[PDB]
Amino acid sequence: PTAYTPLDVAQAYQFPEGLDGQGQCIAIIELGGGYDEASLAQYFASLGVPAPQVVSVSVDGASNQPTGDPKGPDGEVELDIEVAGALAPGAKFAVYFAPDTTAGFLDAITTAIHDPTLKPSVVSISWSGPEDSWTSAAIAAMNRAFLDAAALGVTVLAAAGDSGSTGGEQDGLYHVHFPAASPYVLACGGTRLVASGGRIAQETVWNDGPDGGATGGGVSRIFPLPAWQEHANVPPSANPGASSGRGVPDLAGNADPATGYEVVIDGEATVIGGTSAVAPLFAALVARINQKLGKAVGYLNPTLYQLPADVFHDITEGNNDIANRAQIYQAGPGWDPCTGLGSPIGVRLLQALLPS
Amino acid sequence: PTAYTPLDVAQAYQFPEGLDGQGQCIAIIELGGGYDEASLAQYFASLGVPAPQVVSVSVDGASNQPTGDPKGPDGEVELDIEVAGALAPGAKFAVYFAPDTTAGFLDAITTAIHDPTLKPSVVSISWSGPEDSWTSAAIAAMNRAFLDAAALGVTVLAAAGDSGSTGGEQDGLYHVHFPAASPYVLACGGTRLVASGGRIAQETVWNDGPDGGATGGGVSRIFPLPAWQEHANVPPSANPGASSGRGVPDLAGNADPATGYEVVIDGEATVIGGTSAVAPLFAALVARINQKLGKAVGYLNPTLYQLPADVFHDITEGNNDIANRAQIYQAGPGWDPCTGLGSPIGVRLLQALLPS
Ligand SMILES: [Zn+2]
Ligand SMILES: [Zn+2]
Ligand SMILES: [Zn+2]
Ligand SMILES: [Zn+2]
Ligand SMILES: [Zn+2]
Ligand SMILES: [Zn+2]
Ligand SMILES: [Zn+2]
Ligand SMILES: [Zn+2]
Ligand SMILES: [Zn+2]
Ligand SMILES: [Zn+2]
């Protein structure tokens, strides 16, 4: 019942101090909505941080288009900038607006990672959906773009979803989300964070079922278990058949609205949550790290899974089941299909990524 | 932010079904206050359980003395009966009223465990305080009574305290509470319980610091590490010097007021928490178990620590530090100075206590 500012959450996760993503660019893919910038300047000023430069990029005709909807479209865009910008104010923000279609989504991503002028080193994605609700073509194309981004030295972060292990499908089975299920994507799960003064009192799996949402996570049907996830104790799917797949998510962060983020949407202060708040949070972390290293970390997943356990805060309590019946999936020691490796400890992650 | 009835909590901890403590007597030591019985009958009727017989016993002149104080005295007595009686309605309740003195406290306990007519098999105690704030005489006498109770085949349960690892002492050090620190007492810690339909979604260490209370627990200065606690990974005290002592607590249960118990105090419904809610809860469990076994379990501590781990729900997340600075003490795998062995799983505990 205590709400945080991004700075509070960042201190709890121990983000590298004295860094603000200066000289880095963060791309945000938006499939609808827009941001009113006076509401941004108002937000950054009340936080005591310099307002980061934010530029709009039109994809396939789409534009920065807010109109003051009570909830919905505007909530998506303003959120990412406010959360990531409060933590990486030195970073440049390129927001790519595209039509809400797979063509629009693909084009915004291909445009971003090939942007000659803006040159994003980080790409944050929120829009998700069940992997099997994607056509086989769109999956292949979108997965190719991510592989393209990895070879380009670009980090891509995606939310895992806010509908538990079932993922919003009622067929009676479990479904992970896409693009989160892609192995070329840093998948971000959700947790409930209790922190009081730069330290984590307790952190558990986010699960406000059977109504108010839960972190996505599980085992992919489409994508096989990657080589870097072999020593991760990833279980076979809970669905009948139960063969190995890609484990979702990779990381997790504060996503519970009850312990949510204090933001300003459409001129008015409020508190929000969800895994779509996590991807910008960790995008700022990556930006900060890129500043120190002097080069983009790029594709991170293989490296993350071979780092010492002390680099992360292992979440071991809670489950993904929104119904709380079968309790699938369950968090535990090490990697789990609710929170992945857990929440990152910024300074330790930075230390582990520095040259020997 | 969801409150429970005792029945809800009992289902989560999986209390043995088809048992209600019939033919058992539970003693409750009260050092002040009283209960208005119309408020009791009203409470048990709204729960759909038969109202258990409750008898008052005067010790050293003290009597069942409520007067309708907004908070305080009456809250202690009505609580224990309502929580324990809702779960063991078949049990007889002997409430021993004594003056708020060590003489009164000792006499109420010696009277209870030697009661020729009422014959309690279980004794629930709430009143606690820092072990070193007790005189050496009172400690020795009170500890002797507990040893007497154990040889008499009586189970004694005590709350661990609601002031974290410091225990309410400001000297800059950590203190466990007494009688909880006695090895002849079943010490009950506090947790925050999230359960939704007979299953535990998540359970963590109760800690509403730096203001609203936290579960007591730690390492005793007075009492040495018992033989039955040797294979329990009990750490040496956090205080300077740091020698071995008795580990507090032994068990833990729902004690967070935010996830508290729906009760009726002074005619009006409300929600309460604290470790003083835990001892009556587990006293009902013991009563239910005694019914099935056909004899009192009596001194339980040695048996508990040599039972399989699957009998308990291990709490592994959270800390005892009300300030959340040093984070002492911290919960983890197995026994810890915040929650002990964890919350009991009634059916598994009953199975483990049944003859081979
Ligand atoms: Zn390319
Ligand atoms: Zn399906
Ligand atoms: Zn929640
Ligand atoms: Zn658990
Ligand atoms: Zn884990
Ligand atoms: Zn005796
Ligand atoms: Zn002291
Ligand atoms: Zn609490
Ligand atoms: Zn933890
Ligand atoms: Zn434990």
Token couple for B190: 């506090």
Yes or no, beta carbons of A1 and B205 under 8 Å apart: no
- How are beta strands B25-30 and B122-125 bridged, if at all? parallel
3-state secondary structure of B73: helix
Which residue do the tokens 């009850």 mark?
A258
Tell me yes or no: is domain B1-356 CATH 3.40.50.200: yes
CB B78 within 8 A of CB B35: yes
Yes or no, beta carbons of B204 and A317 under 8 Å apart: yes
**Rounded Cα–Cα distance for residues A8 and B203 (Å):** 24
Q: Tell me the one-letter amino acid at A247.
A: G
CB B273 within 8 A of CB B153: no
B250 contacts: CB under 8 Å, gap ≥ 6:
B186, B187, B188, B189, B301, B304, B305, B340, B341
Closest CA to B331 of B192, B147, B123, B212: B192
Token couple for A166: 């079932």
Most A CBs within 10 A among B2, B193, B196, hence the mutation to make, goes to B196
Experimental method: X-ray
> Which of chain B's residues have a Cβ under 8 Å away from the Cβ of A258?
1
**Rounded Cα–Cα distance for residues A124 and A51 (Å):** 19
CB B307 within 8 A of CB B233: no
Yes or no, beta carbons of A199 and B318 under 8 Å apart: no
Closest CA to B89 of B139, B47, B117: B47
**Rounded Cα–Cα distance for residues B29 and A94 (Å):** 68
Continuous segment of H or E residues that includes residue A99: none
CA atoms within 13 A on the CB side of A111: 20
**Rounded Cα–Cα distance for residues A253 and A4 (Å):** 13
Which residue do the tokens 């178990």 mark?
B289
**Rounded Cα–Cα distance for residues B83 and B263 (Å):** 8
Rg (CA), chain B: 18
Q: Find the farthest-apart pair of alpha carbons in chain B and give their distance in angstroms, rounded.
A: 54
- How are beta strands A261-265 and A268-272 bridged, if at all? antiparallel
CB A339 within 8 A of CB A207: no
Phi/psi at A47 (5° precision): -95, -15
CA angle B275, B278, B283 (to 5 degrees): 140
> Which of chain A's residues have a Cβ under 8 Å away from the Cβ of B203?
317
Closest CA to B158 of B121, B183, B191, B194: B183
3-state secondary structure of B26: strand
CB A339 within 8 A of CB A189: yes
The reply to whether B326 touches chain A by the CB within 8 Å rule is: no
CB A29 within 8 A of CB A108: yes
In angstroms, what separates the C-alpha of A202 from chain B's closest C-alpha?
5
In angstroms, what separates the C-alpha of A43 from chain B's closest C-alpha?
29
CB B144 within 8 A of CB B104: no
In angstroms, what separates the C-alpha of B90 from chain A's closest C-alpha?
31
Token couple for B106: 């000792």
CA distances from residue A286 to A21, A30, A275, A349, B165 in whole angstroms, order as listed = 8, 20, 17, 10, 37
DSSP 8-state code for residue B209: T
**Rounded Cα–Cα distance for residues A310 and B161 (Å):** 32
Closest CA to A174 of A130, A224, A230, A232: A130
- The dihedral through the CA atoms of A95, A99, A100, A105 has a sign that is negative
Closest CA to B125 of B90, B84, B91: B84
The reply to whether A292 touches chain B by the CB within 8 Å rule is: no
For A20-39, b/e burial (b = at least 16 CB within 10 A) is: bbeebbbbbbbbbbbbbeeb
For A122-148, b/e burial (b = at least 16 CB within 10 A) is: bbbbbbbbbbbebeeebbebbbebbee
Yes or no, beta carbons of B317 and A319 under 8 Å apart: no
Yes or no, beta carbons of A317 and B207 under 8 Å apart: no
Closest CA to A197 of A44, A17, A7: A7
3-state secondary structure of B176: coil
**Rounded Cα–Cα distance for residues B55 and B57 (Å):** 7
Token couple for A303: 């490296």
The reply to whether B258 touches chain A by the CB within 8 Å rule is: yes
Bridge partners of residue B343, in order along the sequence: B313
Chains A–B, number of C-beta pairs less than 8 Å apart:
51
3-state secondary structure of B245: coil
**Rounded Cα–Cα distance for residues A16 and A20 (Å):** 9
Domain ranges (residues) in chain B: 1-356
CB count in 10 Å sphere of residue B246 = 25
**Ligand of minimum distance to the alpha carbon of B147:** 6
**Rounded Cα–Cα distance for residues B312 and B282 (Å):** 13
**Rounded Cα–Cα distance for residues A236 and A258 (Å):** 32
Distance of CA A35 to the CA centre of its chain: 19
